[PDB]
Amino acid sequence: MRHLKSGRKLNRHSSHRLALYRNQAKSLLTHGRITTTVPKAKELRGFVDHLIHLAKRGDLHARRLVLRDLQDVKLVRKLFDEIAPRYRDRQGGYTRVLKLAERRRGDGAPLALVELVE
Amino acid sequence: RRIRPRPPRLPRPRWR
Amino acid sequence: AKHPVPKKKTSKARRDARRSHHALTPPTLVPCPECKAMKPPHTVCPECGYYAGRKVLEV
Amino acid sequence: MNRGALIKLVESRYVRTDLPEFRPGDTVRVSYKVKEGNRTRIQDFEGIVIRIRRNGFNTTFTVRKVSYGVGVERIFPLHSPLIQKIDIVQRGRARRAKLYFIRNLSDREIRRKLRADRKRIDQDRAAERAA
Amino acid sequence: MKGILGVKVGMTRIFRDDRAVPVTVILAGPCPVVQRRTPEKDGYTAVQLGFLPQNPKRVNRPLKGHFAKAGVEPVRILREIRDFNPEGDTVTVEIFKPGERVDVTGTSKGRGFAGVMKRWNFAGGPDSHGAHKIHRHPGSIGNRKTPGRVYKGKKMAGHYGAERVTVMNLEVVDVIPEENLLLVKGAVPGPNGGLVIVRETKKA
Amino acid sequence: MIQPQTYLEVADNTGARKIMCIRVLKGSNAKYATVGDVIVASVKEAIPRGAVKEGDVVKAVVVRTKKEIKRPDGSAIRFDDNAAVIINNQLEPRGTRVFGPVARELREKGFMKIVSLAPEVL
RNA sequence: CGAUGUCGGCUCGUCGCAUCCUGGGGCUGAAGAAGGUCCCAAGGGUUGGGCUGUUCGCCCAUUAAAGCGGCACGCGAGCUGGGUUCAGAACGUCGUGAGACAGUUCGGUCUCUAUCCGCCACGGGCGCAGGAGGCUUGAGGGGGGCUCUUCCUAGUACGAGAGGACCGGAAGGGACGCACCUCUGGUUUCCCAGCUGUCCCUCCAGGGGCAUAAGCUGGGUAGCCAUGUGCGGAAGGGAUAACCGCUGAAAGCAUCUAAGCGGGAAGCCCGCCCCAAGAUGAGGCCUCCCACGGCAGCCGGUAAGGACCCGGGAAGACCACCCGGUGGAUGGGCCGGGGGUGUAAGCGCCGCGAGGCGUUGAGCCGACCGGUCCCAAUCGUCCGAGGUCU
RNA sequence: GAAUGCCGGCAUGAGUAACGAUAAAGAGGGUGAGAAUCCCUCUCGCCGUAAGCCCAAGGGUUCCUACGCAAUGGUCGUCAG
RNA sequence: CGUGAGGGAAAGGUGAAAAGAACCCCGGGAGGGGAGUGAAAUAGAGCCUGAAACCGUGGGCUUACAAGCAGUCACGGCCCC
Ligand SMILES: [Mg+2]
Ligand SMILES: [Mg+2]
Ligand SMILES: [Mg+2]
Ligand SMILES: [Mg+2]
Ligand SMILES: [Mg+2]
Ligand SMILES: [Mg+2]
Ligand SMILES: [Mg+2]
Ligand SMILES: [Mg+2]
Ligand SMILES: [Mg+2]
Ligand SMILES: [Mg+2]
Ligand SMILES: [Mg+2]
Ligand SMILES: [Mg+2]
Ligand SMILES: [Mg+2]
Ligand SMILES: [Mg+2]
Ligand SMILES: [Mg+2]
Ligand SMILES: [Mg+2]
Ligand SMILES: [Mg+2]
Ligand SMILES: [Mg+2]
Ligand SMILES: [Mg+2]
Ligand SMILES: [Mg+2]
Ligand SMILES: [Mg+2]
Ligand SMILES: [Mg+2]
Ligand SMILES: [Mg+2]
Ligand SMILES: [Mg+2]
Ligand SMILES: [Mg+2]
Ligand SMILES: [Mg+2]
Ligand SMILES: [Mg+2]
Ligand SMILES: [Mg+2]
Ligand SMILES: [Mg+2]
Ligand SMILES: [Mg+2]
Ligand SMILES: [Mg+2]
Ligand SMILES: [Mg+2]
Ligand SMILES: [Mg+2]
Ligand SMILES: [Mg+2]
Ligand SMILES: [Mg+2]
Ligand SMILES: [Mg+2]
Ligand SMILES: [Mg+2]
Ligand SMILES: [Mg+2]
Ligand SMILES: [Mg+2]
Ligand SMILES: [Mg+2]
Ligand SMILES: [Mg+2]
Ligand SMILES: [Mg+2]
Ligand SMILES: [Mg+2]
Ligand SMILES: [Mg+2]
Ligand SMILES: [Mg+2]
Ligand SMILES: [Mg+2]
Ligand SMILES: [Mg+2]
Ligand SMILES: [Mg+2]
Ligand SMILES: [Mg+2]
Ligand SMILES: [Mg+2]
Ligand SMILES: [Mg+2]
Ligand SMILES: [Mg+2]
Ligand SMILES: [Mg+2]
Ligand SMILES: [Mg+2]
Ligand SMILES: [Mg+2]
Ligand SMILES: [Mg+2]
Ligand SMILES: [Mg+2]
Ligand SMILES: [Mg+2]
Ligand SMILES: [Mg+2]
Ligand SMILES: [Mg+2]
Ligand SMILES: [Mg+2]
Ligand SMILES: [Mg+2]
Ligand SMILES: [Mg+2]
Ligand SMILES: [Mg+2]
Ligand SMILES: [Mg+2]
Ligand SMILES: [Mg+2]
Ligand SMILES: [Mg+2]
Ligand SMILES: [Mg+2]
Ligand SMILES: [Mg+2]
Ligand SMILES: [Mg+2]
Ligand SMILES: [Mg+2]
Ligand SMILES: [Mg+2]
Ligand SMILES: [Mg+2]
Ligand SMILES: [Mg+2]
Ligand SMILES: [Mg+2]
Ligand SMILES: [Mg+2]
Ligand SMILES: [Mg+2]
Ligand SMILES: [Mg+2]
Ligand SMILES: [Mg+2]
Ligand SMILES: [Mg+2]
Ligand SMILES: [Mg+2]
Ligand SMILES: [Mg+2]
Ligand SMILES: [Mg+2]
Ligand SMILES: [Mg+2]
Ligand SMILES: [Mg+2]
Ligand SMILES: [Mg+2]
Ligand SMILES: [Mg+2]
Ligand SMILES: [Mg+2]
Ligand SMILES: [Mg+2]
Ligand SMILES: [Mg+2]
Ligand SMILES: [Mg+2]
Ligand SMILES: [Mg+2]
Ligand SMILES: [Mg+2]
Ligand SMILES: [Mg+2]
Ligand SMILES: [Mg+2]
Ligand SMILES: [Mg+2]
Ligand SMILES: [Mg+2]
Ligand SMILES: [Mg+2]
Ligand SMILES: [Mg+2]
Ligand SMILES: [Mg+2]
Ligand SMILES: [Mg+2]
Ligand SMILES: [Mg+2]
Ligand SMILES: [Mg+2]
Ligand SMILES: [Mg+2]
Ligand SMILES: [Mg+2]
Ligand SMILES: [Mg+2]
Ligand SMILES: [Mg+2]
Ligand SMILES: [Mg+2]
Ligand SMILES: [Mg+2]
Ligand SMILES: [Mg+2]
Ligand SMILES: [Mg+2]
Ligand SMILES: [Mg+2]
Ligand SMILES: [Mg+2]
Ligand SMILES: [Mg+2]
Ligand SMILES: [Mg+2]
Ligand SMILES: [Mg+2]
Ligand SMILES: [Mg+2]
Ligand SMILES: [Mg+2]
Ligand SMILES: [Mg+2]
Ligand SMILES: [Mg+2]
Ligand SMILES: [Mg+2]
Ligand SMILES: [Mg+2]
Ligand SMILES: [Mg+2]
Ligand SMILES: [Mg+2]
Ligand SMILES: [Mg+2]
Ligand SMILES: [Mg+2]
Ligand SMILES: [Mg+2]
Ligand SMILES: [Mg+2]
Ligand SMILES: [Mg+2]
Ligand SMILES: [Mg+2]
Ligand SMILES: [Mg+2]
Ligand SMILES: [Mg+2]
Ligand SMILES: [Mg+2]
Ligand SMILES: [Mg+2]
Ligand SMILES: [Mg+2]
Ligand SMILES: [Mg+2]
Ligand SMILES: [Mg+2]
Ligand SMILES: [Mg+2]
Ligand SMILES: [Mg+2]
Ligand SMILES: [Mg+2]
Ligand SMILES: [Mg+2]
Ligand SMILES: [Mg+2]
Ligand SMILES: [Mg+2]
Ligand SMILES: [Mg+2]
Ligand SMILES: [Mg+2]
Ligand SMILES: [Mg+2]
Ligand SMILES: [Mg+2]
Ligand SMILES: [Mg+2]
Ligand SMILES: [Mg+2]
Ligand SMILES: [Mg+2]
Ligand SMILES: [Mg+2]
Ligand SMILES: [Mg+2]
Ligand SMILES: [Mg+2]
Ligand SMILES: [Mg+2]
Ligand SMILES: [Mg+2]
Ligand SMILES: [Mg+2]
Ligand SMILES: [Mg+2]
Ligand SMILES: [Mg+2]
Ligand SMILES: [Mg+2]
Ligand SMILES: [Mg+2]
Ligand SMILES: [Mg+2]
Ligand SMILES: [Mg+2]
Ligand SMILES: [Mg+2]
Ligand SMILES: [Mg+2]
Ligand SMILES: [Mg+2]
Ligand SMILES: [Mg+2]
Ligand SMILES: [Mg+2]
Ligand SMILES: [Mg+2]
Ligand SMILES: [Mg+2]
Ligand SMILES: [Mg+2]
Ligand SMILES: [Mg+2]
Ligand SMILES: [Mg+2]
Ligand SMILES: [Mg+2]
Ligand SMILES: [Mg+2]
Ligand SMILES: [Mg+2]
Ligand SMILES: [Mg+2]
Ligand SMILES: [Mg+2]
Ligand SMILES: [Mg+2]
Ligand SMILES: [Mg+2]
Ligand SMILES: [Mg+2]
Ligand SMILES: [Mg+2]
Ligand SMILES: [Mg+2]
Ligand SMILES: [Mg+2]
Ligand SMILES: [Mg+2]
Ligand SMILES: [Mg+2]
Ligand SMILES: [Mg+2]
Ligand SMILES: [Mg+2]
Ligand SMILES: [Mg+2]
Ligand SMILES: [Mg+2]
Ligand SMILES: [Mg+2]
Ligand SMILES: [Mg+2]
Ligand SMILES: [Mg+2]
Ligand SMILES: [Mg+2]
Ligand SMILES: [Mg+2]
Ligand SMILES: [Mg+2]
Ligand SMILES: [Mg+2]
Ligand SMILES: [Mg+2]
Ligand SMILES: [Mg+2]
Ligand SMILES: [Mg+2]
Ligand SMILES: [Mg+2]
Ligand SMILES: [Mg+2]
Ligand SMILES: [Mg+2]
Ligand SMILES: [Mg+2]
Ligand SMILES: [Zn+2]
State the total domains in chain A: 1
Q: Could you tell me the distance, in angstroms and rounded to a whole number, from the CA of residue F32 to the centre of ligand 200? A: 59
Judge whether A3 is closer than 8 Å to chain E, CB to CB: yes
Residue A2 lies in a domain: no
Contact D68, F64 (CB under 8 A): no
- Contact between A117 and A84 (Cβ < 8 Å): no
Q: At what angle do helices A60-70 and A14-31 cross, to 10 degrees?
A: 110
Does residue A7 form part of some domain? no
Q: By the 8 A CB rule, do D102 and D64 touch?
A: yes
**Distance between CA atoms of A94 and A76, rounded to whole angstroms?**
16
Method for this entry: X-ray
Query: Among all strands, which nt has the closest C1' to C19 (CA)?
Result: H15
Task: Identify whether A105 is part of a domain.
Answer: yes
Out of E20, E25, E193, closest to residue D10 by CB: E25
C-alpha D67, offset from chain centre? 17
Distance CA C33, CA C54 (A): 11
User: Is residue A8 a part of any domain in this protein?
Assistant: no
**b/e map of A57-95 (b: 16 or more CB within 10 Å)?**
eeeeebbeebeebbeeeebbebbbeebbeebeeeeeebb
Judge whether residue C12 contacts strand I, using its CB and a 7 Å cut-off.
Answer: yes
Min Cα separation E12/chain F (Å): 12
The distance of A21 to chain E (nearest Cα, Å) reads 31
Rounded CA separation A53/A48 (Å): 8
Interatomic separation, CA of residue E148 and C1' of nucleotide G120, rounded (Å): 17
Cis before E62? omega within 30: no
In chain E, the residue whose alpha carbon lies closest to the alpha carbon of D11 is E14
- On whether residue A3 sits in a domain, the answer given is no
**Strand runs (DSSP E) across E149-194, as ranges?**
158-159, 164-171, 175-176, 181-185
What is the experimental resolution, given in Å to one decimal place? 3.0
Q: Within a domain: residue A5?
A: no
- Tabulate helix, strand, coil % of chain A (nearest 5): 55, 20, 30
Q: How far is C40 from chain A (nearest CA, A)?
A: 6
Q: Do residues E197 and E167 lie in contact, with contact meaning Cβ atoms separated by under 8 Å?
A: no
A1 in a domain, yes or no?
A: no
Domain span including residue A68: 14-118
Separation of CA A50 and ligand 133 centre (Å): 18
- Rounded to the nearest whole angstrom, what is the distance from the C-alpha of residue C17 to the centroid of ligand 173? 52
Q: Give ion ligand 5 contacts, CB < 5 A.
A: A 7
Distances (CA, A) of E111 to D18, E159, E163, E187, E188: 44, 7, 10, 18, 17
Contacts of residue F101, defined as CB under 8 A and 6 or more positions apart, other chains included, come to D67, D68, D70, D72, F64, F79, F118, F119, F120, F121, F122
Question: Smallest Cα–Cα separation from D21: which of D55, D52, D65, D56?
Answer: D52
What 8-state DSSP symbol labels residue F33? Answer: B
DSSP-derived pairing of the beta strands E164-171 and E158-159: unpaired
The Cβ of residue A48 has, within 10 Å, a number of other Cβ atoms equal to: 21
* Beta pairing partners, E183: E25
Q: What is the DSSP letter of F74?
A: S
CATH code for the domain of A51: 3.90.1030.10
Chains with 3 or more CB pairs under 8 A to chain D: E, F
A53 is a domain residue: yes
| CA within 13 Å, CB half, C32 | 20
- What are the angstrom distances between the C-alpha of E186 and each of E17, E20, E21, E107? 17, 11, 8, 17
Could you give the CA distance from residue A45 to residue A36 in angstroms, rounded to a whole number? 12
Q: Which nucleotides of G are covered by protein (CB under 7 A)?
A: 3-8, 10-14, 46-49, 55-56, 60-66, 69-81, 83-86, 102, 109-124, 132-138, 142-143, 148, 173-185, 189-190, 201-202, 206-211, 213-215, 218-225, 227-235, 272-275, 284-289, 304-306, 308-317, 324-325, 327-329, 332-335, 337-346, 357-359, 361, 363-372, 374-381
Nearest Cβ partner for F107 among D36, D70, D71: D36
